[PDB]
């Protein structure tokens, strides 16, 4: 996989963000995770965590996996990096997302994220408390 440039347009919620990618505005959904909706428990905390990570970043990058690059809603499907730190992993490691939506062929970082979830769960963080 390869990281590609993008710039933040605006934070949306814990697992979606609006980025400019190849010069076009797109909503990106983070691969392999599920955050609570803003109206659900830890939803606002997940939204605030993602917002902080992407807004504070000097460099955003997107990395598509091997499979589908957009979903049925036209959202980009990618791993999102903020100054080299993967947001998808960071949310799981903080107990603010569950590993989820693991589809064959877009699951390159599944083991990495499951390791993060196990750590969050052992720590009883947030969703795991
Ligand atoms: C993360 C992800 C979601 N989706 C679709 C499945 C779910 O369809 P349904 O909308 O029919 O439930 C929806 C979940 O996204 P959200 O968690 O953003 O709601 O997005 C994909 O198709 N591929 C993916 O990799
Ligand atoms: Ca969600």
Swiss-Prot record:
**What's the protein called, per UniProt?**
Nuclease A
Q: Per the record, where are the segments of Basic and acidic residues compositional bias?
A: 109-125
- The residues annotated as the active site are 29, 37, 75
Q: What does the entry list as the binding residues for Ca(2+)?
A: 15, 34-35
State which stretch of the full-length protein is shown: 89 to 223 of 231
Subcellular location per the Swiss-Prot or TrEMBL entry: Secreted
Residue span of region Disordered: 109-129
Taxonomy, top ranks, is: Bacteria, Bacillati, Bacillota, Bacilli, Bacillales
